[PDB]
Structure formats: C-alpha cells, structure tokens
C-alpha cells in the first residue's frame, strides 16, 4: 500500500463498475457510504471515480469521515464537508506488521495549518514550534515533522495496521462516464412479451425475419415511424416486431 502522509490517487475512468462485489464481500471491516447508500451504486452513473489508498492505525479509521479532527484528518488526509463517495477499510495485521517493528509506515504530526480537502503535502522541512528560527537543524522547538508507526504483530487491536480505500465519485459537467453493469436475461419469441433492447422499450411478439440491415444499423422503423424490427446486441440477428393481438 501507500503511506498515510503521501496517499495514492488512482483515477478510475470509463469502465463497468460493479460495487456489489465490493459491498457483499464481507471481508471489509468498515464500509460507509455518505453521499449515497451502498445498494444504489450499481444503478447510477458519474463522470469520474477517484480511489485513494493508504494505511493507518486501527482506531484512526474514525477520522476518515466528513467533519472530523485529529492528527490524521488535520494534516494527513482531509475529506470535504459534502463528501459523496464511500470509505472502505479492512484489517491487515498479517501483511504490514513484522516482528521487530515495521518502521516504513510514517505519518505527519506537525504542520502549520490544517489541510484543504483533498490536499497533499510531501515536504520534509524542519518544523518550527517556538519563535526561534531553526536553520535546518534539530533541537528544542525544532522538530522533524514525520513519525513512524512501529507496527508489531503482538499489538492489541486498535494498534494493528488497517488498510483504507476512499472512493470519491465526482460529477463535473461532461457528457457521461462509468456506470454500473446493466442487467440482462435470456430471450423468448412467439409470445407477447415486454422487451427491452439497449433502451428500445416496447411490448409485442418477436419473430425471425427476412430483412437485412446495414452493419451499423441497429433497428428498423416503417412509415408513420413505428418500430417494426430490431437487432439484438448479442446474436447479431434481426427480429420482426408485431403488436400483440387486440380487438
């Protein structure tokens, strides 16, 4: 994973996202959704999804939320106050903690001013607590600004490392982007059905035909502009549509 003071930032893009494999995986110790409850994720579409990744202690997962304070949310990773995404977290004691102490996971514990939301700060200047200038050397009131979790496998819970992923769905002003995986099911002809091909919605009885579209043509319509044929998007076969008897 990535440190807590320099988190990563992956920009998921145009794709088919299935938040159900996430939501039901039962391997996550924390799955909170803020802008939007979890079950309705596989039914919406946004412009961009960002995924941020890092590693923190066990009892610091309550500062990854909109409107908190503490050494993590103050100056390591700040979430805006109208967050939209979801926060996922799971314990990772066996991967990240090693006997003798894993001193490779640092965090920032001194900064001049709290972070703006989604702001990032990887500098390593000597902090200056008191009024006396520091001149790049340590000493009283001149502190190195980074500390390291010394993780060890015999730590009580709440001191073992947790890995965190923060998904943030954003909606700029584009034309569209990633959305869930629209469902589908087998077909059935020679019966009055409610069909739906890609968004073409109607009802009637579907038979096989003797038309020949052009490779780019997706459905046919007649005079008076009613749909009387269609192409189905998996067989590449065109089907006649006939209204279901009435009188």
């Amino acid at each position: 994973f990535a440190s807590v003071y320099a988190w990563n930032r992956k920009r998921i893009s145009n794709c088919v996202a299935d938040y159900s494999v996430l939501y039901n995986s039962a391997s996550f110790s924390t799955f909170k959704c803020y802008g939007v409850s979890p079950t309705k994720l596989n039914d919406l579409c946004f412009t961009n999804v960002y995924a941020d990744s890092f590693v923190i202690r066990g009892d610091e997962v309550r500062q990854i939320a909109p409107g908190q304070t503490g050494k993590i949310a103050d100056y390591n990773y700040k979430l805006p106050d109208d967050f939209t995404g979801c926060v996922i977290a799971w314990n990772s004691n066996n991967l990240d903690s090693k006997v003798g102490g894993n001193y490779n996971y640092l965090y920032r514990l001194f900064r001049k001013s709290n972070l703006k939301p989604f702001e990032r700060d990887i500098s390593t200047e000597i902090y200056q607590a008191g009024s006396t200038p520091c001149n790049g050397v340590e000493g009283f009131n001149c502190y190195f600004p980074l500390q390291s979790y010394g993780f060890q496998p015999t730590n009580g819970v709440g001191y073992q490392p947790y890995r965190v992923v923060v998904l943030s769905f954003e909606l700029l002003h584009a034309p569209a982007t990633v959305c869930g995986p629209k469902k589908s099911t087998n077909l059935v002809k020679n019966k009055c059905v409610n069909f739906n091909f890609n968004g073409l919605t109607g009802t009637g009885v579907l038979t096989e035909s003797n038309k020949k579209f052009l490779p780019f043509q997706q459905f046919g319509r007649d005079i008076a502009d009613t749909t009387d044929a269609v192409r189905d998007p998996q067989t590449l076969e065109i089907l006649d549509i006939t209204p279901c008897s009435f009188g």
């Epitope: 894993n102 010394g150 060890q152 001191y159």
Partner: antibody, heavy 127, light 108 residues
C-alpha cells in the same frame, strides 16, 4: 507478566545524593520508553524526566536539570534515577511508567502511554 | 514551550448521577490527552487514551470529548466504589504538564 517494582528510597539530609531503582518484568524492556513522575504529598502529579530506548534523549524539566540524571539497564531490565544537590523540598513519592508514543524518542508508536506499575517514596528531613 | 491545563476541581455528587470535568488546555493547540484515576493510598491508573477510546477492564461508564483546546471527561451512572482523584496529563512537547486533580465526595 507486565509489572514493575521499585526500591531505593528513604530518609536523608539535604545536600546529599541518592540513586533509585525501577525494574521491569514481563515485556521487552529495551523497546519501550520509561518516564519519571512524582507528587509532593497532598499535591498533584508532576512529570520529572524521561529517556528513550537507551538513546540518550533526556529533555529534562525546569530546575530539575543539573540536579538529576537518568540511567537504565536494558540488559537487566532496570532503571535508576540518581539525584544530586538536594533542596530539602523534593521529598515526595515517586513513580516510573512506560511510554510508547513519544516523537523524537522510541521508534514507532506502540500501545498506550503511562501504564503505571510503580511506587516508592523518599524523605528529606533533618530528623 | 510552556503549557498548563485547568479543572473544575473538588466536586461532589451522589449515587447514580452524571459528573463532568473540563480540562481546558493552554495555547498551542494539542491533540488528545488522557484521564487517570487515583484511589488514595495506591498508584494511579489509566482510563482513556487521547480524546477517547478507553482500555480494558474499565466498567465502561466513562467518556471523553477531544476537540482541540477544551476536553471534557464525562462519567455516567455513578457507582459506590468510584470515588478518587482524577488527574489528566497532556502530551506533545518537552514538558508533559498535568491537571490539578478533582476530589470526589458523596452526599449525606
């Protein structure tokens, strides 16, 4: 398991010198930190001194400096506070406690501070 | 670097109530502290790490609230064996200052 024992205090005249003993048990001693804290009888607690995992990082308090010194034995899981130039005023009960969360001190943050398994007093009169 | 904390010291209430102790912190904002109880004739004892999140053993009648420069210990549902002092230690510098204590007394 984790418990501490202390000895070395008694009655002595002012101006003299005395060293204490703060021993450990159970856990690994040379990874933690060790604090020194006191209270004059009938008053509140007061932090006295601290040292890292034998890394020579004292950062003493006010007045205390130049009169106190810290020495721990990582090989024998013991810790000694030696004080010189007494004032006939620092007569108190004294406690040593473990830390795992300081900044320029012990590597990595581990557990809670100040788990407080000590005791032991020292009288400084003329009787 | 000199800081100090305060306390509404020397309170008194009865069995089954709620008490509050407010350690207001000095300048140079900090980040969580602690809460110790001290039964007299003995050694102190940890109850809550920085801000909140008590430890083990504690009968879970205790709560903190850490928001910068003013922290409030809050105990609910008093019990007839929980009268002692209560000194809070603040950390994040060279000199780890303390509070002043809070003596507790029943009602007769």
């Amino acid at each position: 398991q984790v418990q501490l024992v202390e000895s070395g205090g008694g009655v002595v005249q002012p101006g003299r010198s005395l060293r204490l003993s703060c021993a450990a048990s159970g856990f690994t001693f040379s990874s933690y930190a060790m604090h020194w804290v006191r209270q004059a009888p009938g008053k509140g607690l007061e932090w006295v001194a601290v040292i890292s995992y034998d890394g020579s990082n004292k950062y003493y308090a006010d007045s205390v400096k130049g009169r106190f010194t810290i020495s721990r034995d990582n090989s024998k899981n013991t810790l000694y506070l030696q004080m010189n130039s007494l004032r006939a005023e620092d007569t108190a009960v004294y406690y040593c406690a473990r830390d795992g969360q300081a900044i320029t001190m012990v590597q990595g943050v581990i557990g809670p501070p100040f788990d407080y398994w000590g005791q032991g007093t020292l009288v400084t009169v003329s009787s | 670097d000199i800081q100090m904390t305060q306390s509404p010291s020397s309170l008194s209430a009865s069995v089954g109530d709620r008490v509050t102790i407010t350690c207001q912190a000095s300048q140079d904002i900090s980040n969580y502290l602690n809460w110790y109880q001290q039964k007299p004739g003995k050694a102190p004892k940890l109850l809550i790490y920085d801000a909140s999140n008590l430890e083990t053993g504690v009968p879970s009648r205790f709560s903190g609230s850490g928001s910068g420069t003013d922290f409030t210990f809050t105990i609910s549902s008093l019990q007839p064996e929980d009268i002692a002092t209560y000194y809070c230690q603040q950390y994040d510098n060279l000199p780890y200052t303390f509070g002043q204590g809070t003596k507790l007394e029943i009602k007769r």
